[PDB]
């Protein structure tokens, strides 16, 4: 047969909301010098 098979989505708006929420706050690495090391020991690595 075929019969009617409609799709009335109600979870896609939630997925879009969560994706946009996680996209509004970007996150990346941040290299920090170890304790007892030079205060600037991470600048070269961070720049690279």
């Amino acid at each position: 047969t075929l019969q009617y098979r409609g799709q009335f989505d109600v979870v896609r708006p939630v997925v879009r909301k969560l994706v946009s929420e996680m996209r509004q706050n970007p996150i990346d690495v941040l290299y920090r010098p170890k304790d007892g090391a030079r205060p600037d020991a991470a600048d070269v690595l961070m720049g690279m």
Binding site: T1, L2, Q3, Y4, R5, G6, Q7
Partner: protein
Amino acid sequence: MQIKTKGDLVRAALRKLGVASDATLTDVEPQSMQDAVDDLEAMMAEWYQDGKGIITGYVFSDDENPPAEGDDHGLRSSAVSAVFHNLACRIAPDYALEATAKIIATAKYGKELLYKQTAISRAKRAPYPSRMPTGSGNSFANLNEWHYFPGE
């Protein structure tokens, strides 16, 4: 089946009515029997309304093959009782008679049972309308949005 022609159907109707039988010392004339065969043919044609009525398998006699009596009625095994009960009811007024209550009830029940299977087969649903989509669940994959294939 022991009943196999229109003549046997008419004889069974007469036996049920009590007018004539294999036991009676008097019998009906062949002209009366022929008239009863004509009554049966008319009744069956009125029922089987050129294909849109009760389907029974009845085989209509032709004018070239002379005696309508003696032609096999062509009915199934399960239709004989209903057909000859209804025939007895129809032809009873010829003999200043009135088919009794049991005969009437059996004729009604038999006609119902005759039409039951045809009614079940004729109770069908029309296809989907012309402005109905077929939904995303079908429309994905093959991109079909308005067909509603009549395959099954």
